[model samples]
Target: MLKQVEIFTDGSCLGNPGPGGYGAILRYRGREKTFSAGYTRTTNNRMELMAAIVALEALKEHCEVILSTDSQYVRQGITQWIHNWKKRGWKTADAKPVKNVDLWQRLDAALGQHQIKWEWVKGHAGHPENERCDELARAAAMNPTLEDTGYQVEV
Candidate 1:
């Protein structure tokens, strides 16, 4: 049987092109684990997508995942935009190059390991899980950083 899992995630960057981080809280079977990491230089959108990628990649088995995120880029990209973008070879409807192709592909690969339902949550408005995730993200962004290596401004 597939396990039921819920994950709340958030991302932050110290500057538009500076230290960045992602935070994720995973809950399953009455247990919880938090994931976080810092990037020496990255954007908030890349960090957001990375949060989901990290959480999904943590699954050891197939699961029914409720992936909650505040980012329209992350949530909608997975739920709505990615399909067409992939079919058209990763180009926008207007034929512009897609942004964040790396993280998007990472998240797409992670999704292959599960059945995920994207949930959009308003961030930083006192929701306990989301608030905690945001706090974790901010704290991580302030931590010592490492190379992110994702395309800049491709969000």
Candidate 2:
């Protein structure tokens, strides 16, 4: 039987292109582990993808997973949009380059190792774990510890 795991993830940004952070919690067999990190420059979307990436990558082996997030972009992008984007060479139907391709690629790689059920939770509606993750993300963003090297400044 596969090990069953559940994860809650969230992301926060002080400004659209300012400090940001991701928070994730992994629960398995009544035990839990949490992860969070801050970046000096990033977007909310990037941090959202980063949260999923880091949490899934933390699993040491393939397993069954329920990964929950408050970001519609992350949930829908991975579940519905990524396949088309990949098929079209990472371009949208309008032939525009997909944003956050780096994190999407990383998230895709991490996703390959497990069977996952993606869930969308309403944000700030008082979900306990989601609230905790939000707290963690916001705090980390305020005390950013690293630079988002992949973050590109728009011209």
Candidate 3:
């Protein structure tokens, strides 16, 4: 039987290019898992992608997953445009280089290894896990801590 899993993820960056963080919450089989991290410098989009990637990678093996993220970039890129972009060698429709191609590629590969359903959740809309993730991410960003969440798998 396929296991049912749900995840909520969020990312925050202070000053757009300053301190940043990402957070995720995972629920499966009556257990809960949480992840979050802070970075010295990064962008919101990077943090957003990082959150989803962290959540998805937390899965033990190939399983059915429903991933909720507040990032249109994370949702649309994976669900809609990633295939075309990969087919075109990670170039945009206009032949421009894709931003965050590294994370996108990592996320794409991680996603390919599992059965995933991507969902976009509205930010600050009172979704419990999503809201918690947002709070964690924002707090991490503001604090600028040195401890990593140990959730990042990317080099």
Candidate 4:
């Protein structure tokens, strides 16, 4: 039987292009895994993409995943428009280079490794796990206890 997992992720930036962080919670087979980290300099979009990347990276392998995030950029970019962007050479409809192409590329690659369903949730609407992720992200951003929160996969 295939395992099913649900993940909640969130990202926060102290300043739009300043210190940033990401948080994610992965739940599978009644077990919960949490991940969070920060960066010295970044943007919200990068953090958002990082959150999902972190969650998916934590997966053991190709399990069915429902990855929930509050970032339209992350969700829409993957679910609604990534193929179109890739077809357009990573440019937007108006021929503009996509911002954070590096992070998007990392996220795209990570997603390609799994069976994932991207989902969007409202930020700050009182969802427990989501709220916890937000808190972790913001706290990580404010304090400098970790390295860059860029996306990276572990095996």
Question: Which numbered prediction scores highest in lDDT against the true structure?
Answer: 2
User: What RMSD, rounded to one decimal, does every model reach?
Assistant: 2.6, 2.3, 4.5, 4.9
Candidate 3: the clashing residue pairs are none
lDDT of 4 at 138: 90
Candidate 3 lowest-lDDT run of ten: 146-155
Name the best candidate (by TM-score): 2
- Backbone clash total for model 4 is 0
C-alpha local distance difference test of each model = 0.83, 0.86, 0.80, 0.79
State the lDDT of candidate 4 residue by residue for 5-71, as single tens digits: 8888889998756888888898976779899888887778788888888888777667788877788
lDDT of 2 at 147: 88
Worst 10 residues of 4 by lDDT: 146-155
Single out the weakest 10-residue window by summed lDDT for candidate 1: 118-127
Q: Write the per-residue lDDT of candidate 1 for residues 37-144, one digit (tens) a residue.
A: 888888888899888888888889898988777887776786789888889988777787688878787888889888888778776553588888888999999994
> Total clashing residue pairs per candidate?
1, 0, 0, 0
Question: Which residue pairs collide in model 4, if any?
Answer: none
Per-residue error (Å), model 1, residue 109: 0.9
Candidate number that wins on lDDT, 1 or 2: 2
Better of 2 and 4 by lDDT: 2
Candidate 2: C-alpha lDDT: 0.86
Candidates, ranked, TM-score: 2, 1, 3, 4
**Residues 4-70, model 2: lDDT tens digits:** 7989999999898999998899896567989999999999989998988888888887879988788
